[PDB]
Amino acid sequence: ATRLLAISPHLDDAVLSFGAGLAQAAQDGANVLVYTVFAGAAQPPYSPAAQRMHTIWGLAPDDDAVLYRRKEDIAALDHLRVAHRHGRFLDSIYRKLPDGRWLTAHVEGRQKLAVNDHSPDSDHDLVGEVADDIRSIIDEFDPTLVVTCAAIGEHPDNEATRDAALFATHEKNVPVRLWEDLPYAVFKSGAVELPQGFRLGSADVSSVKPEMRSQKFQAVERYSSQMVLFDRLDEHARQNAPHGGYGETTWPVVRSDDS
């Protein structure tokens, strides 16, 4: 039996990036679990940046935004008929730096967010924490395959998720693959810097039935808060394997020579 563990950074990323792979796995009778790492329930007060994001998402600025998101995630994943697990790490907009500053600051005029300068110590400590949680889930669920994000777009939460997954899957002897982060891959290079000792294998551009694209995009629409689109995604996918259907690009990750 095939047990697919998809490790999403935020509530929507696995469906947005890999919703057709999840839909295909489900269709094939695989046992599928989407664990979202940064699904921690944030406790107020919220930062100026979080409060702005919440209002952008159509919420009162002091509302329980993570609860709202978690319910959208359950709706989207039940549409795909796959399991969820909501992890305890706080989204970037809720995190504090060890000196008390918010991790992310609000920036005026469309830019939204930028991350505060800080020492790498706290980024490395976050990876080890996330890696401990992934190792426990690997022990419990016993996946035959783990898929997580490439962190195209360099979101710090996606980078932490990716790095933690690479360390945990290497220690546990479980194969791992990275998906192309959407929508970031539509407008970013695709080149990422993996932690020392890891490298990408050859890309696989999947070929999915139009039925699987429709089921993915229906599941995307359960994330109401995040929308205010599908055409862009379509053109990126067709642009990846032309003479081909919809598909998603993933890469295996292996150890580099001499590492």
Added chain:
Amino acid sequence: XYXXXYX
């Protein structure tokens, strides 16, 4: 760096 969007 980081930075928001959508662009």
